[PDB]
Symmetry: C2
Amino acid sequence: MEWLVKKSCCNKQDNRHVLMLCDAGGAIKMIAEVKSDFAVKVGDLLSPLQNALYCINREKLHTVKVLSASSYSPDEWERQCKVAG
Amino acid sequence: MEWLVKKSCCNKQDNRHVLMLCDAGGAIKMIAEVKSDFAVKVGDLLSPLQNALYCINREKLHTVKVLSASSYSPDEWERQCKVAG
């Protein structure tokens, strides 16, 4: 699955973001803690390469590692935008 | 196969390098035209992720795209360190 980044949330010193993502279909919305050397900004597409390795906007060279995920809740996003900063 | 970068060769404006690589065993030495956002320096290891997608020193987030390859000849390296700069 490809995921559209619906919301982003940053780190003050880390390479991490916390992302709200939803599938094409948007049946499924997830919160994900990711790590990348490149910026992923809302309206970006993440496409699977390998196990938890994704690329940004189909650029294979711009990879991101999913460090963890959960499905979305309004509260869990704020729970998770805490551990983030 | 993993490849050890034996020699590197740069681009003045591109994201490209030309690399001499050899397999562990060093039976096989190749010249390769690659593209990366990260630096690959001699004594680096490139490990396969996917088709022509490699990572540097087993860092999945530091990917490189092989744009083309040939086996090594002394002359072909200089032939190729021309197209490079």
